[PDB]
Amino acid sequence: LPLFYAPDIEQSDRLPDDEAGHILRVLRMQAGDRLRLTDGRGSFFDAVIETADRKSCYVSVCGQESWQKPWRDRITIAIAPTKQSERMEWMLEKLVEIGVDEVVFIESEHSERRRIKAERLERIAISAMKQSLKASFPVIRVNIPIQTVIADTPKAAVRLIAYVDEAVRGRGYPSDFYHVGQDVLILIGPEGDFSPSEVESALLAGFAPVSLGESRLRTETAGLVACQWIHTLQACYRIG
Amino acid sequence: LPLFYAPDIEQSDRLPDDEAGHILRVLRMQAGDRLRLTDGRGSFFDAVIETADRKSCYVSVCGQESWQKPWRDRITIAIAPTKQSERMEWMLEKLVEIGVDEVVFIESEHSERRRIKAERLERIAISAMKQSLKASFPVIRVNIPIQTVIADTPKAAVRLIAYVDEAVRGRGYPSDFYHVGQDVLILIGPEGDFSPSEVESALLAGFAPVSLGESRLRTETAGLVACQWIHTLQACYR
Ligand SMILES: Nc1ncnc2c1ncn2[C@@H]1O[C@H](CO)[C@@H](O)[C@H]1O
Ligand SMILES: Nc1ncnc2c1ncn2[C@@H]1O[C@H](CO)[C@@H](O)[C@H]1O
């Protein structure tokens, strides 16, 4: 079973301090015990504990394989942060479980404006990677202005913008715009939604306006639903 | 406009204490101010604050309407409870947002045998109902034997059993079996998954074996994903 993260495994047999502590102290494993490792960059490694020190754990690598990513294309969720950090952190973990390549926390007219710490979110993604047995974790970006996302998202991507609130004066669904074979980015707004002016700018740049369904979702739940829309479409649209 | 919960609104013009406190003491609203209530049984009510006391908030009701549920058919998630109840609290909140009619916590061979904090789950369901502007919250069942779910779920209903693990494993996807117009129940197992014989029994009864995707999901995530599969399928066919 369990997978450990060792980003420097290709150049070093010393495991990171945190993984070492867990493996030796918490799990009480010993020299000769086998381990699965990932570098976080698409590979799994078979390893055996060589040496256990008071502080550190050293392994030998016996073999290696490339992970086959269990979805197609690149999926980016670009989304407003939640007021409560627990909610966006719970969401991040779920997105990693489901399958995501990039999560961008944005700034928009009606969004929360506090600086978001990238490192804690990275650690949460790494944790969900190991838990769900994946060999990669998404790119995380924080405090990115909405207009940067609109202007600079690679235009070969299907770029969807989700909005709900009645005041924002037609939509369609992700199934109307998403094609397997292309990258996809979904932009999801704050509790107060995107402004009309933000939407026009999105559409001018080639974004397609979408609904995620008929229920009124919290921000973090809309991130999850949007990502699952993509996975669902990749499955229920397989030909054969 | 925020929505408040007043289950007794048809018999009483006194608001429940937690809502009264929030409205007067936290939100600072006063008599003459308009409110939206639900009884949690499918109706919204238009109301006005009439009187505030040192202890109570009294309203008058000036309109009532039946809620239009934002999905079709009935959706049931029948799931093994996680060791930690916090995971199940998060899941239920999101299921209520997304849209579900019934959530059934099961007992199966490998499932966690524990009391479910059912009062807590109702409270979460009620909060999610109010946040997402719904007028009802799902039926929540606890400690239901898996064999009861297998045997007694109506045959008219699309019945899916999700399983993933190697020893147990052809599966389709929920889209190979569900089409709009029919009720749906999805059976989701514990960490150890359903045993072979549970699968066999379910399959004997007419359940369809499904995969939810290629990713390894925690129990709580699989609940959400299965529910969303249904909503997605419904949207595609509007
Ligand atoms: N049903 C929905 N359809 C489209 N977008 C949605 C839906 N529910 C939530 N959202 C998104 O979540 C954000 C916060 O509610 C909104 O700005 C919007 O981007
Ligand atoms: N890919 C999947 N396909 C089917 N069921 C799944 C999948 N991932 C998780 N589950 C469900 O979640 C439970 C816990 O893994 C399983 O018993 C199963 O019911």
Characterise the protein shown here.
The structure is a homodimer. Chain A is of the alpha/beta class. The first copy, chain A, folds into 2 domains: 68 residues, Hypothetical PUA domain-like, domain 1 (Ribosomal Protein L25, Chain P, Beta Barrel), CATH 2.40.240.20; 172 residues, Alpha/beta knot, CATH 3.40.1280. In chain A, 30% of the residues lie in helices and 25% in strands. Chain A has 6 helices and 10 strands. In chain A, a hairpin with a 4-residue loop joins strand 2 and strand 3. In chain A, helix 2 packs parallel to helix 3 and helix 2 packs parallel to helix 6. The longest helix of chain A is centred in the C-terminal third of the chain and has 18 residues. The two termini of chain A are 34 Å apart. The interface between A and B is medium-sized, with 30 and 31 residues. The site of one adenosine has 16 residues of chain A, from helix 6. Chain B: It is found in: Cytoplasm. Chain B: It is an enzyme of class 2 (transferase). Chain B: Belongs to the RNA methyltransferase RsmE family. Chain B: One of its GO terms (cellular component) is cytoplasm.
